[PDB]
């Protein structure tokens, strides 16, 4: 329920048990893969959710599945980036933390298509952030200089980056 220094609140984690289900038990098969995510800490449950994704078994790229299994750190690194300069223990751009869930939920409809890479890619998923992020850039730089619009243009080129290990 909290966006700490090592976590950023996006959506349910349907990307965790994927570079795993696809190699040990269950494998690739045609049907609807129902995900049940039950969270806990010590003796208190915090959130339980369900989800349904569609698959057929369209090959496997082990590297891309690995990057897909490791996405929350990429979101934390995208949020944590300072606007300018660098400072220790810097939280960084908290309005991006407000707009992460909308682009995440717009992406999350074709989870079964991102899993097998039929037509939707990391780069095709990247384009969804542009509209919300251009809306943010007006507020975070509400100036009327050449430097204002140039900073907005640099700001709209911020994309999450893939991390495998």
């Amino acid at each position: 329920l909290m966006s700490n220094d090592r976590y950023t609140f996006a959506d349910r984690d349907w990307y965790s048990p994927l570079f795993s289900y696809l190699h040990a038990e269950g494998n690739s098969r045609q049907g609807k893969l129902w995900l049940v995510g039950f969270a806990s800490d010590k003796a208190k449950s915090i959130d339980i959710w369900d989800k349904i994704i569609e698959l057929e078994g369209t090959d496997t790229n082990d590297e891309l599945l690995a990057q897909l299994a490791n996405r929350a750190t990429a979101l934390n690194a995208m949020r944590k980036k300072p606007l300018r300069g660098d400072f220790k223990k810097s939280v960084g751009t908290p309005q991006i933390a407000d707009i992460i869930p909308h682009a995440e939920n717009r992406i999350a409809i074709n989870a079964g298509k991102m899993t097998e890479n039929r037509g939707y890619s990391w780069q095709d998923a990247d384009t969804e952030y542009g509209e919300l992020l251009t809306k943010v850039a007006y507020s975070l730089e509400p100036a009327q200089t050449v430097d204002a619009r140039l900073k907005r243009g640099n700001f709209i080129s911020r994309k999450p980056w893939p991390i495998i290990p």
């Binding site: 100036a143 009327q144 200089t145 050449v146 430097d147 619009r149 140039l150």
Partner: protein, 165 residues
């Protein structure tokens, strides 16, 4: 818009003595010196009688001062945020580009009563970089509504688009 075009035409119809008399009154208001007030009245007031949307007294006086100082030729399509932008490329990206950019973006914090010296130095760097053409009508029409965000919003946008070429 009509009324502007005849004002710029009457400015171009002026002769040596009239340009000199408006040149000596740079950096001042009009009410102090009477020949300047009379010349401006004889050049401006019939247009305000005939046309309702004739330029305001302050903006017309300022544009008269700038035309008397610089005497640029009137030509459509040579507006200020295009020549700025076509000029900015020939400079060193490390040092001189922020120096010119700061003097260009200082205009978004000044009023029409305070916008004589920055315009003087900007047309100065034009005259130093060998330019003879400038759209005065567009500058008058944007100065008459200088206190609106979309006008300076399309100011630096014309700039960015001319600079990126």
């Amino acid at each position: 818009n009509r009324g502007t075009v005849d004002f710029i035409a009457s400015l171009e119809n002026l002769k040596e003595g009239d340009l000199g008399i408006l040149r000596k009154l740079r950096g001042a208001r009009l009410d102090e010196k009477l020949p300047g007030f009379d010349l401006f009245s004889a050049l401006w007031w019939p247009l305000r009688q005939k046309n309702q949307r004739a330029p305001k007294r302050e903006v017309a006086w300022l544009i008269a001062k700038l035309f008397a100082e610089f005497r640029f030729e009137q030509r459509e399509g040579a507006t200020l945020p295009i020549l700025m932008g076509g000029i900015c490329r020939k400079l060193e990206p490390k040092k001189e580009l922020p120096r010119v950019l700061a003097r260009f973006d200082q205009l978004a914090s000044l009023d029409i009563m305070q916008m004589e010296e920055p315009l003087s130095v900007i047309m100065g760097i034009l005259r130093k970089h060998q330019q003879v053409c400038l759209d005065w009508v567009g500058l008058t029409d944007v100065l008459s509504f200088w206190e609106q965000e979309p006008v300076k919003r399309e100011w630096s946008d014309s700039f960015i688009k001319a600079y990126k070429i």
